[PDB]
């Protein structure tokens, strides 16, 4: 029970770029057989993951010169030294030498680029949804960048907490943006109720909040 | 050649027994130092490995979980079990089988199974189109109340592809939802039908929304 942290959780690197994942263990991982069993695995989206470091330094197969494993005893560190396409992904440090078998909480390498503020696109519940008997309302906070946001939404002028519903996508392939859904999960009978429904949108971008709202008398 | 393919039930009852095969080639369990062991990850969260066994037949399992695991081997035709018994929804996850190569660490993964331990039952989507409310147009498509995962979602039958944001599945109660967002210039629609195209393999279930303007209603 050796409790693996990594550092940071998302690392934002340019391509060409220095790249330094920290990871650090409740313990000393040295094995009884004197060999410090640390790991470094590579884990591309929709793939299972692929190892890259073994015993702290020595680098696996097709694993190119650019990476290097360090550290001893406590503190252990991989350095990625010229960033590529293909070196993105979630990298976990492992640790093979107590029983039970720890892995790290993951670092997920990502590209950094300019910053840009949400889109945020508000639907009302549909007709073919009223008719059936639900009324989920729909939130779309497009394209952005820093990765983290926050959405708060106001019922008339009231803010729910609960019976919201949020989603997230990787990074865009071309423009290297986040997007975001939240949908606020309503019966028809509380929806039939109030009138003002509002998806207020929280990012580093501005520092006013991004309202976007619709009235019920209309649709 | 090295490969490592793992079969499983995919889908199964709270409180029934999962029984998972890792079989494979490019080695042998009969060779000296060889292991084969088990790891889980849980629909997109960190790593946790479960249990594995030596070519001795020494068997190590995880202390959280020990009682309920059961692994064996079959050195004559190259498999290897895996046992876990009265399985809940918290072991919804990717089982993945990999080679331990003499030294305490995995080198070679597999495919990775993906089990889910649900009550529910076999349930097609309801898609709902998002058009917006009463320059560019932002679209929505609400798949909701599905079972089980995956759907498919598609714009104009796949002639759509650009500002196209599909989000990954949240599970709603029982049942899955998904939404993807779809932005177009102004003068693409209205005026050329967007339709939104949805494929649930299990339910056989294929489905065309056209989303068309919001009409006005007032009961």
């Known amino acids: 029970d050796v409790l693996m942290t990594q550092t940071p959780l998302s690392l934002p690197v340019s391509l060409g770029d220095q790249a330094s994942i920290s990871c650090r263990s409740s313990?000393?991982?040295?094995?009884?057989?004197?060999?410090?069993?640390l790991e470094w695995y590579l884990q591309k989206p929709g793939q299972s993951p692929k190892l890259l470091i073994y015993?702290?330094?020595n680098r696996f197969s097709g694993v190119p010169d650019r990476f290097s494993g360090s550290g001893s005893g406590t503190d252990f560190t991989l350095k990625i030294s010229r960033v590529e396409a293909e070196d993105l992904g979630v990298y976990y440090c492992?640790?093979?030498?107590?029983?039970?078998?720890?892995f790290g909480g993951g670092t997920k390498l990502e590209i950094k680029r300019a910053d840009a503020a949400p889109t945020v696109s508000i639907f009302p519940p549909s007709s073919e949804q009223l008719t059936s008997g639900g009324a989920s309302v729909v939130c779309f906070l497009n394209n952005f960048y820093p990765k983290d946001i926050n959405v708060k939404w106001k019922i008339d002028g009231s803010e729910r907490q609960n019976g919201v519903l949020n989603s997230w996508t990787d990074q865009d392939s071309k423009d290297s943006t986040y997007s975001m859904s939240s949908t606020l999960t309503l019966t028809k009978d509380e929806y039939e109720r109030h009138n003002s429904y509002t998806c207020e949108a929280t990012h580093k971008t501005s520092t006013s909040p991004i309202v976007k709202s619709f009235n019920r008398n209309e649709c | 050649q090295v490969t490592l393919k793992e079969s499983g039930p995919g889908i199964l009852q709270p409180s029934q027994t999962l029984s998972l095969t890792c079989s494979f080639s490019?080695?042998?369990?009969?060779?000296?130092?060889?292991?084969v062991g088990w790891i889980r990850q849980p629909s997109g969260k960190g790593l946790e490995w479960l249990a594995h066994?030596?070519?001795?037949?020494?068997?190590y399992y995880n202390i959280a979980l020990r009682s309920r695991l059961t692994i064996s081997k079959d050195t004559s035709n190259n498999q290897v079990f895996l046992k876990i018994a009265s399985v809940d929804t918290a072991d919804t996850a990717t089982y993945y089988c990999?080679?331990?190569?003499?030294?305490?660490?995995?080198?070679?993964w597999g495919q990775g199974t993906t089990l889910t331990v649900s009550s529910a039952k076999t349930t097609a989507p309801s898609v709902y189109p998002l058009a917006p409310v009463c320059s560019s147009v932002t679209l929505g498509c609400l798949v909701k109340g599905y079972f089980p995962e995956p759907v498919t979602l598609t714009w104009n039958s796949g002639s759509l592809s650009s500002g196209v944001h599909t989000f990954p599945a949240v599970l709603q109660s029982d049942l899955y939802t998904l939404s993807s967002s779809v932005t177009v210039t102004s003068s693409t629609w209205p005026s050329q039908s967007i339709t939104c195209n949805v494929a649930h393999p299990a339910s056989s279930t294929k489905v065309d929304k056209k989303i068309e303007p919001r009409g006005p209603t007032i009961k």
């Open positions: 313990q000393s991982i040295v094995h009884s057989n004197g060999n410090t069993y």
């Open positions: 492992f640790q093979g030498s107590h029983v039970p078998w720890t």
């Open positions: 015993k702290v330094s």
């Open positions: 066994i030596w070519w001795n037949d020494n068997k």
């Open positions: 990999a080679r331990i190569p003499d030294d305490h660490y995995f080198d070679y």
């Open positions: 490019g080695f042998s369990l009969s060779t000296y130092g060889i292991g």
